[PDB]
């Protein structure tokens, strides 16, 4: 006697509230970087939707399992280890496109571990990247 509609409304409702609280943790500096990265990763997504889908295809992104998501992480990190700003903005877009594709399957734990560990490796030697997004204007 469980209502499919209510459960998923309550879950989404709380998560939405949890995102807002993560947003207030972003500061003037981080809020602007966000908006600047937003614009870059969006423009990448139109032209390289053709190109990024092919990567989403090579990496079997429908596998939705740690055994594979762990491999997706390793492979993405391997590409960074072999790391200029342009590639970094492209990795972010790739992940956004993995989210777009697997967003209906729901939130799963491995992806979070992936999003954090990749977000982490990208932060390495941020200096070269900060310049890229801030020579826009």
């Amino acid at each position: 006697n469980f209502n499919n509609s209510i459960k998923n409304v309550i879950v989404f409702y709380i998560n939405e509230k949890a995102l807002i609280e993560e947003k207030k943790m972003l500061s003037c500096y981080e809020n602007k970087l966000l908006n600047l990265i937003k614009e870059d990763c969006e423009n990448i997504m139109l032209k390289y939707k053709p190109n990024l889908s092919y990567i989403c295809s090579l990496l079997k992104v429908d596998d939705t399992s740690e055994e594979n998501i762990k491999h997706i992480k390793d492979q993405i990190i391997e590409s960074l280890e072999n790391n200029r700003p342009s590639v970094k903005l492209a990795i972010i877009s790739l992940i956004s496109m993995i989210v777009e594709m697997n967003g209906y399957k729901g939130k799963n734990i491995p992806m979070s571990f992936l999003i954090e560990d990749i977000a982490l490796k990208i932060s390495e030697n941020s200096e070269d990247l900060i310049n890229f997004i801030n020579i826009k204007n």
């Binding site: 990448i44 990024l52 590409s79 590639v87 492209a90």
Partner: peptide, 22 residues
């Protein structure tokens, strides 16, 4: 199974190239 690994890094290398000029 290494061929899929190569093309992914190869395909990312193009996106960064095109994106460095513009």
């Amino acid at each position: 199974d290494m061929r899929p690994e190569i093309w992914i890094a190869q395909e990312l290398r193009r996106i960064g190239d095109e994106f460095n000029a513009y």
